[PDB]
Amino acid sequence: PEEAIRRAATILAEQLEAFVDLRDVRQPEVKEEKPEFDPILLLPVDDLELTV
DNA sequence: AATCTATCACCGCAAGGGATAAATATCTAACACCGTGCGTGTTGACTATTTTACCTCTGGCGGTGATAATGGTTGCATGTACTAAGGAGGTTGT
Numbered sequence: 001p002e003e004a005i006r007r008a009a010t011i012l013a014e015q016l017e018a019f020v021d022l023r024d025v026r027q028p029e030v031k032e033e034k035p036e037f038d039p040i041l042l043l044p045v046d047d048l049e050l051t052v
Numbered sequence: 053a054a055t056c057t058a059t060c061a062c063c064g065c066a067a068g069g070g071a072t073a074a075a076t077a078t079c080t081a082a083c084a085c086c087g088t089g090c091g092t093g094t095t096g097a098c099t100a101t102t103t104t105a106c107c108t109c110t111g112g113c114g115g116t117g118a119t120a121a122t123g124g125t126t127g128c129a130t131g132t133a134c135t136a137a138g139g140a141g142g143t144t145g146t
Contacts, residue, residue: 007061033070052062 021027036042 003060030070035071050062052060 038047
């Protein structure tokens with residue numbers, strides 16, 4: 001389950017035609033985000049640049 | 053505990069979205085002034101703060117009435133189911 005997740009769950013990209021613009025009408029509304037910056041002592045191990 | 057090939061995919065690395073912070077412009081608030089009026093001060097006359105004195109409230113409680121009145125109240129403990137004990141007394145027995 002440490003492999004069988006990171007595209008195995010994003011199959012959600014195949015369950016969303018029912019709900020998030022069913023048609024052809026993307027509208028002006030945002031994504032409104034989360035930033036925390038380099039090189040803060042709290043930053044994830046991914047901020048060493050990794051390998052699969 | 054090292055090796056990797058061969059998974060399912062994260063990175064490989066192009067694009068672009070929001071963000072925030074700069075500059076501007078607006079807002080308000082903090083203040084310093086002024087003016088008001090109140091609680092700044094002593095003095096003085098008031099009248100009723102307190103005390104004691106006096107004259108005379110409220111409520112302390114002790115005292116007990118007499119034409120005569122002279123057989124009383126009191127209602128439901130409980131109705132069941134048990135059974136252990138004591139109580140009775142005549143008698144046929146110990």
